[PDB]
A paper describes a structure:
To initiate the SaPI cycle, a specific phage-encoded protein binds to the SaPI-encoded repressor Stl, acting as an antirepressor.
Since motif V is always disordered in the two structurally analyzed mutants (Dut80αD81A and Dut80αY84I), these results reinforce the idea that the Stl:Dut interaction requires the apo form for Stl binding but with the motif V somehow stabilizing the Stl:Dut complex. In view of these data, we speculated that this mutant would be able to order the conserved motif V, although the kinetics of this process would be somewhat affected. Interaction analyses with Stl, using BLI, showed that the Dut80αG164S, as Dut80αD81A, had a reduced affinity for the Stl repressor that is further reduced to undetectable binding levels by the nucleotide. On one hand, the motif V conformation induced by the dUTP would interfere in Stl binding (dUTP decreases association rate); on the other, an alternative conformation of this motif is implicated in complex stabilization (deletion or mutations affecting this motif increase dissociation rate).
Residue numbers in the entry:
A (entry chain A), B (entry chain A), C (entry chain A): 2 to 170
Amino acid sequence: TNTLQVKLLSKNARMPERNHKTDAGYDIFSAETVVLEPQEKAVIKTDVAVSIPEGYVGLLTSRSGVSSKTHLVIETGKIDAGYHGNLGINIKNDHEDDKMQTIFLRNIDNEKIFEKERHLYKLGSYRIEKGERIAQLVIVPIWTPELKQVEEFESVSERGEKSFGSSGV
Amino acid sequence: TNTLQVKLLSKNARMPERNHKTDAGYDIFSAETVVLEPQEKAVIKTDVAVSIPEGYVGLLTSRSGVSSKTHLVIETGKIDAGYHGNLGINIKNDHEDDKMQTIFLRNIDNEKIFEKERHLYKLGSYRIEKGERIAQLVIVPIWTPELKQVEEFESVSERGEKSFGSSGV
Amino acid sequence: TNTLQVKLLSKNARMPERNHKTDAGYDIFSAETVVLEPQEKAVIKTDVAVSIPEGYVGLLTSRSGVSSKTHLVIETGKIDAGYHGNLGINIKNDHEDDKMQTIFLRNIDNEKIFEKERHLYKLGSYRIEKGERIAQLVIVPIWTPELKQVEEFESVSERGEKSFGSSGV
Ligand SMILES: O=c1ccn([C@H]2C[C@H](O)[C@@H](COP(=O)(O)NP(=O)(O)OP(=O)(O)O)O2)c(=O)[nH]1
Ligand SMILES: O=c1ccn([C@H]2C[C@H](O)[C@@H](COP(=O)(O)NP(=O)(O)OP(=O)(O)O)O2)c(=O)[nH]1
Ligand SMILES: O=c1ccn([C@H]2C[C@H](O)[C@@H](COP(=O)(O)NP(=O)(O)OP(=O)(O)O)O2)c(=O)[nH]1
Ligand SMILES: [Mg+2]
Ligand SMILES: [Mg+2]
Ligand SMILES: [Mg+2]
Ligand SMILES: [Mg+2]
């Protein structure tokens, strides 16, 4: 216990490491370089596999910096215990496709990228480099009971059926 | 303990079941058939109610397959302990509305749907059938302390106020 | 133990309080008034700081009411233990920018706002008032093991490398 097995699947892969000593998540490095146009979706390889023990789940989620500064949206992945495959980052460039054109790509600091040779890109296009920290992994314990069908619940609650903004705002 | 009460609210409802033995979440079946246009939002009924015990929360979240293959975005729901109402799936078709037209709907495998009779749809429109697994439920334990206002914290940390991409990328 | 330190950073800040007795999250009050145009992104100040103890993470996430009724999308924040800075709400108005114009803003109940003096707004624009509950905070325990590189995992699983809709739909 108190150890997690990690396998690197290629030379493009880098070991997860958490920022601060008491930090929740282990920052994830991209194992490939990808340009994403507006509204373009993709699964980004990390070339990294883990072995989360039973009774736990992994949360492959976004970082506050990247997600707040750019239009790169990462759908939080639920990494099952026993999944030994390549961790994929479920991502979308949710920048609107307004049909505009530029010569500058954006990095994940939302800074314009200057290249020697000039190409035409769709506005709002991003580039992710191999080795950049675009995500992180947080492991939490789960409760996994056997399900039992009932006609009525054992105990009545104060909440009942209240939902979706019932307490208001 | 080690059991969760589940109530089926109609004949359209189906019991949650998890895929693998050590899997984190219980796949959720839609209890209705719905077509969603681009940018259309909805709450999808499961006709299923649960009784998560105190000290736990339910995460009504997305599946990797559906979310990565389609523009169907599910906002992760936080199912409170004691909520005995109908579990609703908070969903949006975030496909852009470009005013294009087609005769093919898409399923949640993003495959074109062929019908005998031909209708005109907005491009990027999806159809969810009753009985399809569009989501899953993961239960985790929560910490629920009493709050105490302070002027200063008891212990100084290494992180302090650092946030939003402070460690960089 | 069983207590969480909370610091209010200004007179605009309000103490987090959970809705029901067994509720998972503590509703978060905005400490500022902001208008968000379509596709506009921002980090919204709460002027509130907490001291989550080691072994835990905070989930600064959305409410079902606001998120389902409006186009205001909150990216779930992972609040590290030891972070004593101002809690920021990572938000985007994902309403499409169709270049339409109106005289009515929308509140976070998606109701049209009537003002004495009439201004022109982009359609799909929202207004968040100081003091409104736009988010909530749920704290869960985390597992934080030391990482160990391996060439192969200790135990073979039933899942293996199966992922992204492998069980189908
Ligand atoms: O996606 C969801 C989210 C929540 N729910 C249920 C469970 C939850 O207990 C209830 C409300 O959860 P929230 O407290 O997170 N939303 P809100 O604060 O707007 O509702 P309320 O005012 O009643 O607390 O609605 C769903 O059915 N689906
Ligand atoms: O929505 C959020 C997310 C995070 N935070 C805070 C808490 C968290 O401890 C801090 C940074 O969290 P992350 O590590 O997930 N983001 P990032 O990796 O970009 O920042 P840093 O480089 O400092 O770790 O910012 C917020 O205030 N709101
Ligand atoms: O973002 C993700 C999400 C999941 N995964 C992995 C881990 C997880 O164990 C696997 C599938 O997770 P889900 O069960 O949540 N998705 P789905 O139900 O569509 O796949 P499957 O049918 O195999 O269970 O894919 C990723 O690599 N990245
Ligand atoms: Mg970080
Ligand atoms: Mg969008
Ligand atoms: Mg699954
Ligand atoms: Mg609530």
